[model samples]
Target: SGAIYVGNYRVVNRHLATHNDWANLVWEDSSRDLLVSSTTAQGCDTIARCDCQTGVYYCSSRRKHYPVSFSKPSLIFVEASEYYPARYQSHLMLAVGHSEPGDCGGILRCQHGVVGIVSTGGNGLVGFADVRDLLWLDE
Candidate 1:
């Protein structure tokens, strides 16, 4: 509904699906690649590519840039039930067990690989959308 400014980054496009609780902001002329945490204290040492191609892996949160290992992919469910009810496609959604206010839009990383973006959180859970497909959309 309005414009957002972040240093030299320009918001060229945006994607959102409220039912899925997911959103993405596309930047124009982003010269710098976003870096993620390479490891966690719990021994998650692999960082796959941005796509969730490496199968289920351990993930951590970039909440306020503070790395915190939340949950592994296997531990979360892909079903759309009242307990974890988001209409997101099973494969495109990711959820973790913990989050706080102001954590939305933060990066969710598997080791150092970018996996998802924080969508929503409450009741001891956080939702994320796999950012792989959103990267290709025009708007």
Candidate 2:
């Protein structure tokens, strides 16, 4: 029931990895878009792995897309200021920027290549899930 329609395709919400907030979406059938193969995350950058500052951009649900700078690695804090260190391992905090509700799963790209998947953001900042260790998970 948790499925979203992207264009003509039905992206079924297969799974959600809590550590990374990675919402794994699976296609309905064997059919797929050509852009999928081409745009796959090449690999995560070393700088991003360490949560070092870097420039990156991601597609936004409201506005096509926009670029933002990395601020630091952080946890998804609650209103009470509590932090989840377990989830922090997969998060990369970004500098002040504009992000929308549906932008969480967008691809984060840099000059070198794709870096991570947009995780969450608000109040003048955003976060992404590092894909470096996730790219070759199947292998």
Candidate 3:
């Protein structure tokens, strides 16, 4: 295991809202289970309240549901000790919306949440690639 890098290459100009934001899930060539919600790192146990309007969700407090980025967060791969190329399978790695297999166990950070490699083993948790612009890795 050496040094491998993953980057967020999508150009996001839109503002990502809380609770209103969404993410597409994808599972590689495995057979587990994955679920994504509005929760943030280790933030699935806290329950808040929200009011729904004609066409919107309202809440007076901010301690509502999970907290993601005000903008789409790029699922980053910190890369293991070594670049394990071809370690992940194709075909099913880009599938959208859950209903497959793959979970990153949980988040390790916030401000810019980080999903560690051993977060969840097997085929890997990063299912599909981002649909952003610049595809470059920084490390």
lDDT values, one for every candidate: 0.36, 0.42, 0.22
lDDT of model 1, residue 112: 39
- Model 2, range 60-127, lDDT digits (tens) per residue? 65555676777544444422212222222323556576775566556665654555556556786666
- Better TM-score candidate (2, 3): 2
Instruction: Give one digit per residue, the lDDT tens place, for model 1 in 1-139.
Output: 1111223222211232132112333332111111121111233222234533333222234323434444333223333433234333332343445665345455556543556555445676665544443333212
Total backbone collisions for each predicted model:
0, 0, 9
Off by over 4 Å in 2: 1-52, 72-89, 135-138
Worst 10 residues of 1 by lDDT: 30-39
Q: Please report the TM-score between candidate 2 and the true structure.
A: 0.49
| Candidate 3 structure quality by residue, lDDT tens digits, 44-119 | 2211111111111111122122322121223433233232332332211221122112122222222332221112
Ranking by lDDT: 2, 1, 3
* Residue pairs whose backbone atoms clash in candidate 3: 1-81, 1-82, 2-81, 2-82, 10-132, 10-133, 11-133, 38-66, 39-66
Best-performing candidate as measured by lDDT: 2
